[PDB]
Subunit: 486 residues, 3 copies
Amino acid sequence: NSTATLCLGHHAVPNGTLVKTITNDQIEVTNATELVQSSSTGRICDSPHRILDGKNCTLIDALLGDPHCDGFQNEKWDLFVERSKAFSNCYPYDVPDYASLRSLVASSGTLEFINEGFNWTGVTQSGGSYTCKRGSNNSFFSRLNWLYESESKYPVLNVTMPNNGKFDKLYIWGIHHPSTDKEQTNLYIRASGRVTVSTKRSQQTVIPNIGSRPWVRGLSSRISIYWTIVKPGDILLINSTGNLIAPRGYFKIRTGKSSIMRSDAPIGTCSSECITPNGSIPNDKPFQNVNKITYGACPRYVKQNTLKLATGMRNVPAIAGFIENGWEGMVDGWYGFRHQNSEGTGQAADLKSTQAAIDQINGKLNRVIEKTNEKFHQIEKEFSEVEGRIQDLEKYVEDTKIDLWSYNAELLVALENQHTIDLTDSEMNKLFEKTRKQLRENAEDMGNGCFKIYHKCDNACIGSIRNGTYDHDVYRDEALNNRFQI
Amino acid sequence: NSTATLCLGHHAVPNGTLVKTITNDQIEVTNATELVQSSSTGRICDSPHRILDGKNCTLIDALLGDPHCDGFQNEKWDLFVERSKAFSNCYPYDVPDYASLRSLVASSGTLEFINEGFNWTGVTQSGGSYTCKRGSNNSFFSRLNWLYESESKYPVLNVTMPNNGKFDKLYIWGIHHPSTDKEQTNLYIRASGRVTVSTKRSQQTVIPNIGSRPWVRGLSSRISIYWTIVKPGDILLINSTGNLIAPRGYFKIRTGKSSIMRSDAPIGTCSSECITPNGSIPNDKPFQNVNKITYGACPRYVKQNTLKLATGMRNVPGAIAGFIENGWEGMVDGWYGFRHQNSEGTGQAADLKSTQAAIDQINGKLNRVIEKTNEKFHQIEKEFSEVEGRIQDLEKYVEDTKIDLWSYNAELLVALENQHTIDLTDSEMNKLFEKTRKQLRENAEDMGNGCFKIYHKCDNACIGSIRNGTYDHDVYRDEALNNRFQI
Amino acid sequence: NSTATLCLGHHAVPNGTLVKTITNDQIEVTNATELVQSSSTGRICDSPHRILDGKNCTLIDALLGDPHCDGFQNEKWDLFVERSKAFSNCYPYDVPDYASLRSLVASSGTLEFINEGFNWTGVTQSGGSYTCKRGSNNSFFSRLNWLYESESKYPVLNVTMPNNGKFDKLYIWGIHHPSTDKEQTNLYIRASGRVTVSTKRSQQTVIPNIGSRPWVRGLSSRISIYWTIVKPGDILLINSTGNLIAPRGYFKIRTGKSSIMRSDAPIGTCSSECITPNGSIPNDKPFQNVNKITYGACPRYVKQNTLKLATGMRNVPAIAGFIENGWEGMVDGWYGFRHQNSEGTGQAADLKSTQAAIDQINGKLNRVIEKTNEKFHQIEKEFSEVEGRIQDLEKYVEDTKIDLWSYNAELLVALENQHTIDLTDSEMNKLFEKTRKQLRENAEDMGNGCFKIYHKCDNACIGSIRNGTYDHDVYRDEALNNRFQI
Ligand SMILES: *[C@@H]1O[C@H](CO)[C@@H](O[C@@H]2O[C@H](CO)[C@@H](O[C@@H]3O[C@H](CO)[C@@H](O)[C@H](O)[C@@H]3O)[C@H](O)[C@H]2NC(C)=O)[C@H](O)[C@H]1NC(C)=O
Ligand SMILES: *[C@@H]1O[C@H](CO)[C@@H](O[C@@H]2O[C@H](CO)[C@@H](O[C@@H]3O[C@H](CO)[C@@H](O)[C@H](O)[C@@H]3O)[C@H](O)[C@H]2NC(C)=O)[C@H](O)[C@H]1NC(C)=O
Ligand SMILES: *[C@@H]1O[C@H](CO)[C@@H](O[C@@H]2O[C@H](CO)[C@@H](O[C@@H]3O[C@H](CO)[C@@H](O)[C@H](O)[C@@H]3O)[C@H](O)[C@H]2NC(C)=O)[C@H](O)[C@H]1NC(C)=O
Ligand SMILES: *[C@@H]1O[C@H](CO)[C@@H](O[C@@H]2O[C@H](CO)[C@@H](O[C@@H]3O[C@H](CO)[C@@H](O)[C@H](O)[C@@H]3O)[C@H](O)[C@H]2NC(C)=O)[C@H](O)[C@H]1NC(C)=O
Ligand SMILES: *[C@@H]1O[C@H](CO)[C@@H](O[C@@H]2O[C@H](CO)[C@@H](O[C@@H]3O[C@H](CO)[C@@H](O)[C@H](O)[C@@H]3O)[C@H](O)[C@H]2NC(C)=O)[C@H](O)[C@H]1NC(C)=O
Ligand SMILES: *[C@@H]1O[C@H](CO)[C@@H](O[C@@H]2O[C@H](CO)[C@@H](O[C@@H]3O[C@H](CO)[C@@H](O)[C@H](O)[C@@H]3O)[C@H](O)[C@H]2NC(C)=O)[C@H](O)[C@H]1NC(C)=O
Ligand SMILES: *[C@@H]1O[C@H](CO)[C@@H](O[C@@H]2O[C@H](CO)[C@@H](O[C@@H]3O[C@H](CO)[C@@H](O)[C@H](O)[C@@H]3O)[C@H](O)[C@H]2NC(C)=O)[C@H](O)[C@H]1NC(C)=O
Ligand SMILES: *[C@@H]1O[C@H](CO)[C@@H](O[C@@H]2O[C@H](CO)[C@@H](O)[C@H](O)[C@H]2NC(C)=O)[C@H](O)[C@H]1NC(C)=O
Ligand SMILES: *[C@@H]1O[C@H](CO)[C@@H](O[C@@H]2O[C@H](CO)[C@@H](O)[C@H](O)[C@H]2NC(C)=O)[C@H](O)[C@H]1NC(C)=O
Ligand SMILES: *[C@@H]1O[C@H](CO)[C@@H](O[C@@H]2O[C@H](CO)[C@@H](O)[C@H](O)[C@H]2NC(C)=O)[C@H](O)[C@H]1NC(C)=O
Ligand SMILES: *[C@@H]1O[C@H](CO)[C@@H](O[C@@H]2O[C@H](CO)[C@@H](O)[C@H](O)[C@H]2NC(C)=O)[C@H](O)[C@H]1NC(C)=O
Ligand SMILES: *[C@@H]1O[C@H](CO)[C@@H](O[C@@H]2O[C@H](CO)[C@@H](O)[C@H](O)[C@H]2NC(C)=O)[C@H](O)[C@H]1NC(C)=O
Ligand SMILES: *[C@@H]1O[C@H](CO)[C@@H](O[C@@H]2O[C@H](CO)[C@@H](O)[C@H](O)[C@H]2NC(C)=O)[C@H](O)[C@H]1NC(C)=O
Ligand SMILES: *[C@@H]1O[C@H](CO)[C@@H](O[C@@H]2O[C@H](CO)[C@@H](O)[C@H](O)[C@H]2NC(C)=O)[C@H](O)[C@H]1NC(C)=O
Ligand SMILES: *[C@@H]1O[C@H](CO)[C@@H](O)[C@H](O)[C@H]1NC(C)=O
Ligand SMILES: *[C@@H]1O[C@H](CO)[C@@H](O)[C@H](O)[C@H]1NC(C)=O
Ligand SMILES: *[C@@H]1O[C@H](CO)[C@@H](O)[C@H](O)[C@H]1NC(C)=O
Ligand SMILES: *[C@@H]1O[C@H](CO)[C@@H](O)[C@H](O)[C@H]1NC(C)=O
Ligand SMILES: *[C@@H]1O[C@H](CO)[C@@H](O)[C@H](O)[C@H]1NC(C)=O
Ligand SMILES: *[C@@H]1O[C@H](CO)[C@@H](O)[C@H](O)[C@H]1NC(C)=O
Ligand SMILES: *[C@@H]1O[C@H](CO)[C@@H](O)[C@H](O)[C@H]1NC(C)=O
Ligand SMILES: *[C@@H]1O[C@H](CO)[C@@H](O)[C@H](O)[C@H]1NC(C)=O
């Protein structure tokens, strides 16, 4: 035979993967990678973030100084983990705007407390209760000071505490709501008391409401917790005629990246930057389906449980070229040559075109994988109580956010996959045209991805075509003689 | 040395449509479809959602038990429709945080009420008023209990009601603000009263303010409405020495997909999943411009009133010529096809396979644009009757931010999709041309206008063999090479 | 000698610019434009928006009528600019909902005040203080009326003011908190006063708290500011037994595009639609990095400090064609021809293909640049105090928004640049194919972007190829003779 065949082709695999594009919902590619993190280890890694396990204590109980929370005194955290088993074991209390106090302490990230010498002359300090046992002693919240009558007298208190420092001061104080009038008059001589806590710019007044309350841990009395922030150069001024649960000092309030999370996941010895209530998750992938509640450098939450990014070309199950099919038998390259000549048949991968496609697919992998982590503060996203307007707005904000990011994730994968298909198809065409330019007038396109070479073309000659060193002039006379005969 | 011409082309229409792409603001295509729902029937369909027309009653008036709202007792709804003509015809009242009470009742979706036996020994029950007529006699809110003196005595009430069930209880109660001291002392012996309603985790104390308020429906007194939710295992405790408007029981409070909408649109007999204050709208399209207030499975609201998605190729208005120059208005039975000119005359034939390939891809993207579409969650309020400050600004800002982002998404999506449709329909034309040139081998030359000069005798059957893909170039190669390569 | 060479090419520049695409993080193009506004002039332009410089006055002090703010009476604004140097110099006061009042007045855009004749029979009007000097005399807030005892009597007030107009009325009023019981009884006979301000649909009751507050400008007393909006057809009813700081009328409350901004930037005589606290910025570009706080028609805020949009093709620094190289020596076009023939060598730009590429790039420039400005009202985005739940939600919404727009901006530039690279490559190939179709059998593709023309091809013949009027039949006999020799 005075001719040879040179076919251009691409590889194929027996186990393709379905992905989505702009055109079709399901197209098979040779390989893909998952972009949605859907699994967790189940453990909260104690590195690199400072994790603080609240165990039996809520953050507020550790703030007030519930006795079984004494170990939390002056503690700091990057992430405070509140357990569902936590409980209160001191004086029954409520906190108006509980969520806001819990949030502002959590964000501050410290329970550092500085005692201050308040001048409570005329009243008895450190009132206790059998409902707040600390060891063998009736006691009280470690950071609050229960004031009451001294010598059957409760003089009007007018006590000041200036902030001469360079930091903000967080003062926690309260008001005692006795259950009976006798109880009211025994502790505070008057049948009713008043508290005004003021600064240069603010004032807070609260009236105790004597009366029976539903029984909670052996009492029908209550304490209401309030807070006051005193800026540097401002002054705390306390006026009371009874029922004041006084502060023993202030908490340092700092600005930082700390937060709080509800979780029953065990704390483990490992390292992971992203934390969810289900446990830590890796943050290599750009999206995650584990939990919309996150802490740290985290993939963005989406509704999809899987989004596959194509990392290879379309998978397509005498000799023939790429127009017909792909080559499962080609394992050492993505594109290559098959030939038939006087020496038989052969196959060789084209490394340069293979690397050009691989470099682009790895290129888009870096862009899709590095424009990734959400890294700012998080509102609450789960609610135990029905609250109306503001809770509705929080849910609406989070739902709007998730739908937009789910849309972004869906579009990104479809656009990226369409481009991956296009670029891998383009490399095939570029190799074919490159080969056709080499052959000049010595070959004809058979239309199936193969060239009919109109001269004797041994393996070294075929190698020169794969080489880019084929000299068409050497064979032109023979080839034109074979092509243009009658 | 006879020859023939075979031209490749695509169709064109006289009435094209302008669409947008990544490049141009206006490019004419053969066909397009609208993606923004911009019209409504004006009618609220009563299916498949349970619609409840409030008619003359607000949701709160039906909750409290205004006499002309008695027909709303124990009713449920998926969507409560409040009319602008609604009015109150009972005791003048106000509700601190009205919007929150209205919202949580609306979301619960039921006015189911369970009477309970409270112990009001020592006081007179069921106080009435002439401004709240029921039938012929002075009456009051059906679900509220006006307590006052018994035998010139109002003992300190200390009444309990445990929650021993497995669901939450919503208690509606109130406080009477008399206009004069005589009124205060006649009904409630002391010159001032107190109310404390508490649970294990909450307590609410409110002080009546005796005095005249502006005249409303014949009275200068007021009732202030409050509410309390009691969890299972918790206990309601009521302590009062006067002015208490007592509850007669609790409302069931549920968690579900119910809501409330202000609208004057009539309710109709039809079926439609998306409801807006303008009426029901179809939800086939991905976007809508009718109203940012929606209920049900609805297209997403965008600022654009039209977004046209290309569903055909670019529209482009004696020898024959191919696709390079123009399109073929005379081709009606296909999108791509052939024209030939040979010894037997001229002819035209559509290529069915390549036409379907284009249509299949365009229908493919039509599905993707339409299937990832409906918003399916709860909606905050988006219109406001009073100017309120911080929280209302944030609600408006959230909604404005959302709409701008979805408007951007819709604009980009249509421009990308249209660019791809133009590109794929152009590609099908080029692939059909390349497919033909591969068949002809050395028997033809590209004339540069979308046509081939075939350098051999090429009768109608021979032309048909090229369109059919069965043309054998070897049969004609000798004749063709002789015609091509002469001096 | 009896042949010619015709090469197809595109231009190149020595100083390319790096942009991003879908594939690579850094690809050099001939030209690009910046999409992120990152600089400000430092000046707030007084046009075309009505700027009102508060100078020494906060908006609230101008509202109440602090004497050194008398010049702001009845003033209007599009944007009120509050300075950090502002101060109060009247009676010490607080506003329980300061931020909300400041916001609704700012949004209304006017301090227009309508005096009304209230019936204060039985009390003395226009109470003053030495802490609020107007000229040289004890005075008070210009818009408030300090009522107190007349003839050692303070009768119970029951005063009405109906709204019979067609607009809403904003009433600003207050309550006096005396520091001692002596002040309380001297001004108001009773040891305590009560105020109820009501309408058909609302009622507000407030109790003074007698007692010492921290020293502010020589006094320990306070005024608490409250407000009431009265709709058309509604009625204001004021009931007082002491301590009432009465309104002298109402402020007009309008609905419009006005707002308030904190800034120390100087106000300028210039024109700029977009204002930031750093100063006015141009709004030609679609995005900006200057400040998330904006007023007017503004580019959207993004985290990126630069986003470069390609406005030219990839930059690729005898004769050869585009397969190898770009042509830095081609300055008058984007694509063109280089030839070698019997009359010498030459270069010519192809205007049609250059304009086709430029028109597509200018076309996408309009779409990227014209659909751009945010044109609605803005929440607060910086906070002086630590506040809890609602502030967290405000921060979270703004952070969510900025990340979404930052993502949109990144994806848009990557897609646009990929398409710009692709469309400019396509124009080069289309020009090459157009030339190849013209030449028919008279030339062969040399594989480097050049044609070998197998006939004598003078300057006029080359011109006919570039003009699209080359007649291949004229030269086909000569060309076939040179090509097909054996
Ligand atoms: C329910 O709430 C009311 C309101 O706080 C509570 O009222 C208190 O009732 C006691 C009697 O039970 C009053 O004490 C009496 O005052 C007179 C005044 O002279 C005195 O002579 C009597 O010996 C007795 O001390 C008390 O003043 C009153 N407190 C207020 C603020 O009005 C009531 O106790 C609550 N009941 C329950 C069961 O919670
Ligand atoms: C006003 O009404 C409430 C409603 O009952 C009264 O509260 C009740 O007070 C008694 C004790 O005074 C509580 O009984 C306790 O029950 C536990 C359960 O085992 C038991 O261990 C204690 O030894 C004691 O028996 C009862 O729980 C409590 N009810 C609620 C709902 O908390 C209140 O005392 C009345 N106050 C008056 C009349 O002043
Ligand atoms: C404005 O609101 C005030 C605050 O409630 C109302 O004050 C009430 O005024 C009446 C007399 O004007 C007081 O009643 C009198 O009490 C004395 C006490 O010795 C008695 O001797 C008289 O026979 C008469 O009953 C009433 O106590 C007082 N309310 C309170 C809580 O102190 C006033 O009525 C309102 N004015 C309006 C709406 O015009
Ligand atoms: C405190 O002042 C208010 C208002 O200055 C007094 O309320 C007024 O009471 C009169 C008495 O009926 C109301 O008269 C009504 O006039 C309309 C006119 O159309 C008429 O249709 C009614 O049948 C009735 O006669 C008047 O509307 C009402 N004003 C308001 C704003 O509600 C109040 O009586 C004073 N309180 C004391 C204790 O003096
Ligand atoms: C502004 O408020 C004052 C006080 O609330 C109103 O003045 C009061 O007007 C009534 C009727 O004009 C007076 O009643 C008269 O009392 C005299 C005895 O002094 C009696 O001889 C008459 O037959 C009549 O009953 C009332 O005394 C008077 N009170 C005061 C303190 O002057 C005044 O009408 C209000 N202004 C307007 C425009 O409504
Ligand atoms: C702290 O705040 C309380 C109220 O929030 C202020 O209470 C007031 O205390 C004075 C005593 O300095 C009381 O005045 C006295 O009343 C007796 C009894 O009639 C009288 O005989 C005396 O001549 C003297 O006037 C005043 O009633 C009381 N206020 C109230 C509303 O009851 C206290 O002054 C504040 N202390 C400081 C240092 O700011
Ligand atoms: C309740 O306690 C407060 C806080 O200790 C007392 O306020 C203080 O009152 C004194 C008396 O005038 C103020 O002294 C003044 O200081 C200024 C600033 O240098 C000075 O220029 C004056 O000549 C005068 O000496 C002091 O500033 C003030 N402190 C605060 C924080 O307000 C108040 O006196 C007590 N209440 C009663 C009724 O005594
Ligand atoms: C399928 O594609 C993935 C992603 O490109 C390949 O996984 C990468 O493999 C290289 C070298 O083996 C690593 O350096 C990358 O970190 C891997 N990336 C990811 C996301 O895993 C994988 O090798 C391909 N072939 C398969 C899975 O058979
Ligand atoms: C991670 O944990 C959360 C809750 O801690 C899981 O969310 C619940 O999933 C169950 C699965 O049946 C649902 O029934 C609940 O309605 C979900 N609750 C909430 C509040 O979302 C979540 O499924 C976990 N992630 C997993 C298992 O991948
Ligand atoms: C809604 O309320 C209006 C106002 O009361 C009702 O219209 C009145 O209806 C009664 C009874 O038919 C007539 O006697 C009155 O003459 C009507 N007045 C006016 C001004 O129209 C209306 O019927 C109510 N409709 C419903 C469904 O409750
Ligand atoms: C549906 O009704 C709404 C109002 O319920 C219309 O929206 C308002 O229409 C008026 C009339 O032009 C405008 O002045 C308002 O500015 C519109 N408000 C908003 C938020 O858009 C809306 O145009 C109606 N749609 C149809 C199709 O009738
Ligand atoms: C690089 O591209 C920019 C943008 O296309 C060119 O700047 C434009 O120049 C025209 C004509 O002078 C102006 O009408 C446009 O307003 C300009 N646009 C922008 C965004 O500045 C610039 O000339 C190009 N540079 C080179 C060297 O070609
Ligand atoms: C803003 O207020 C400050 C402080 O009152 C002013 O500074 C005073 O300026 C005037 C002349 O400009 C002098 O009479 C005073 O001696 C300055 N210092 C003081 C009073 O401590 C400033 O001028 C005011 N600026 C404006 C624009 O009103
Ligand atoms: C515009 O002004 C803001 C604040 O006045 C600048 O942001 C601050 O920049 C400094 C560095 O100069 C940082 O230390 C602060 O932390 C920044 N604060 C905030 C809130 O961002 C901003 O850089 C200015 N931008 C321009 C273009 O002038
Ligand atoms: C197919 O199987 C091989 C080994 O059997 C594996 O390496 C490859 O990842 C698989 N392909 C895909 C797309 O998972
Ligand atoms: C938590 O409380 C339970 C029940 O009182 C107790 O058995 C357990 O030891 C506590 N754990 C810690 C860490 O305090
Ligand atoms: C505390 O205040 C009293 C005034 O009641 C004062 O006499 C005393 O010096 C102050 N300091 C003390 C007791 O250390
Ligand atoms: C291919 O090229 C190499 C050098 O690039 C040469 O050594 C070899 O002989 C050529 N022919 C083949 C490999 O058939
Ligand atoms: C235009 O497109 C729509 C939707 O793709 C299709 O239903 C309709 O039949 C098309 N019309 C023509 C004339 O092609
Ligand atoms: C209601 O409460 C009163 C309180 O004095 C009590 O005497 C009476 O027995 C109670 N009635 C019933 C039916 O339980
Ligand atoms: C294709 O169609 C033409 C016309 O009917 C005919 O000449 C030819 O043999 C057909 N070949 C097929 C269907 O394989
Ligand atoms: C096109 O330009 C060539 C350059 O020489 C010229 O020969 C020819 O006449 C021109 N034709 C037209 C139509 O401009």
